[PDB]
Paper text:
The bifunctional dehydrogenase/isomerase [name] is an essential UFA biosynthesis enzyme in the widespread human pathogen [name], a bacterium etiologically related to 95% of gastric cancers. We demonstrate that the [4Fe–4S] cluster functions as a temporary electron depot that receives electrons from FMN and sends electrons back to FMN to achieve independent bidirectional internal electron transfer.
We obtained crystal structures of [name]–holo-[name] complex at 2.8 Å resolution with space group P21 and [name]–octanoyl-[name] complex at 2.3 Å resolution with space group P212121. In contrast to the [name]–octanoyl-[name] complex, both of two [name]–holo-[name] complexes in the asymmetric unit were well determined and essentially identical (RMSD value of 0.4687). holo-[name] binds [name] predominantly through its α2-helix through electrostatic and hydrophobic interactions as expected. The PPant arm of holo-[name] stretches into the active tunnel of [name], where it is stabilized through hydrophobic interactions with [name] residues including I147, S149, G184, and Y277. However, superposition of the [name]–holo-[name] complex with the [name]–octanoyl-[name] complex showed a surprising ~30° rotation between the [name] molecules of the two complexes. Specifically, holo-[name] rotates in the clockwise direction along the α2-helix with the sidechain of [name] R164 acting as the rotation fulcrum, allowing D35′ and D38′ from holo–[name] to form salt-bridges with the sidechain of [name] K152, which were not observed in the [name]–octanoyl-[name] complex.
Numbering used by the authors:
A (entry chain A): -2 to 363
B (entry chain B): 4 to 74
Write the structure that this text describes.
Amino acid sequence: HHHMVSTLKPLKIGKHTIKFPIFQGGMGVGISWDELAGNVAKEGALGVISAVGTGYYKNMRFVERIVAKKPFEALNFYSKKALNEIFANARKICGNNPLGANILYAINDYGRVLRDSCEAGANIIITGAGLPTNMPEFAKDFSDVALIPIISSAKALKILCKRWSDRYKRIPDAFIVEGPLSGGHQGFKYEDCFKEEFRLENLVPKVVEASKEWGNIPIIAAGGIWDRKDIDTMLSLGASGVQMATRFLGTKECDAKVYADLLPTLKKEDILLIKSPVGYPARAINTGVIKRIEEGNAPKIACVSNCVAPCNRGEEAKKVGYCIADGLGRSYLGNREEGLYFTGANGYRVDKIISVHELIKELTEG
Amino acid sequence: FEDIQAVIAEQLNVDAAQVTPEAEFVKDLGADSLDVVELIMALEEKFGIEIPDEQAEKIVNVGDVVKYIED
Ligand SMILES: Cc1cc2nc3c(=O)[nH]c(=O)nc-3n(C[C@H](O)[C@H](O)[C@H](O)COP(=O)(O)O)c2cc1C
Ligand SMILES: *P(=O)(O)OCC(C)(C)[C@H](O)C(=O)NCCC(=O)NCCS
Ligand code: SF4
């Protein structure tokens, strides 16, 4: 058997077309950087560079100031120099193929980092972890940049569109609808993450229906999508595309090489939903800092990187027992005892680490 | 105040008698986060003001909103 062409159609979001209607979802602190995102884009999908915690890149090679072995304040945690370098090496692999930058709305200096990402050469900005009513204020000098909020309801879509038109004379170029089986921070209160009412298959039609009201904005389904069979399910319900992350977390090109070591062993019951200083529930693996807190021998919390506004500078980190900047940075550096590790609900289905090329083919043949 | 009360009443599908300067949109009037945003939305049109999110995050009870419209 040879490699066969896709019956999936190319996807247009902004001025940019991607050959396959698949986003590789942004994965925070060094999981989806230059190698991963560049290869994904080279293979015809949308690679998405996570702009969070770039100071940790290559063990903080591009920071001006380190306190307690951590990047000091948002200027160093979100290092522009590092981000520029990640994008440059990603473009060594993908050239002019489109790239996203993923930026959580909750971060301090959100606007500066959005602008940084445009100047680093992102084609598309994707933002969740909030209701991003002010995404466009910093993009006003980057007309070519597409803007994509992550939402969990049609209500959110309507609100965003109205507020964007009012303030910026713009409407989103697309929406990602992220269901409750996704990795990282969930867009629902802990309680709601279990109801049937919110599965992805029930949300996508509602959001699609609400989007038609605004000129048929593209809808990208995310959360729990595993193979081509799932892709076609979401497209049949009206999604224009899909965003996947766990699967790409299971590739060799993933930038945080420790995951190539940890996912194949992952049992379903060691995947938990935990609290976060960001103020949303987060899906994580029962390892690293999470085991240390269970044992009482977790790291001291001392707010050095000041990564997100809702934590209030270590306050909520202490209330929940860990610092997410320290944990995620530690994971990228390979710290198995003190790192924080995330996964989608399907993480346990990973048994072989496969190449991005082989993954994209399995999802796109015929 | 009577005009603030009327928009708060209609938006949350709630009687003008419950909209007391003490009543909190979260707890007393029964609104979820996006009800809040729609409401801010309706107030800054009705009275031609802008309420930035920074300023808006701080308000939880209708007195807080009343006082902000005031100044
Ligand atoms: C390890 C990991 C890290 C993630 N980090 C982010 C992030 O930084 N920003 C974001 O918007 N989404 C993040 N997510 C969510 C993904 O971008 C994606 O939307 C979601 O995981 C898709 O579901 P799937 O993993 O089941 O495909 C993360 C997911 C994983 C698994
Ligand atoms: P409210 O102010 O409590 O509601 C917040 C809402 C639900 C509006 C927000 O849109 C949201 O939670 N979005 C989801 C962002 C996301 O899914 N992921 C970030 C990944 S790390
Ligand atoms: S203490 Fe809170 S704000 Fe400071 S770096 Fe840790 S998670 Fe971020």
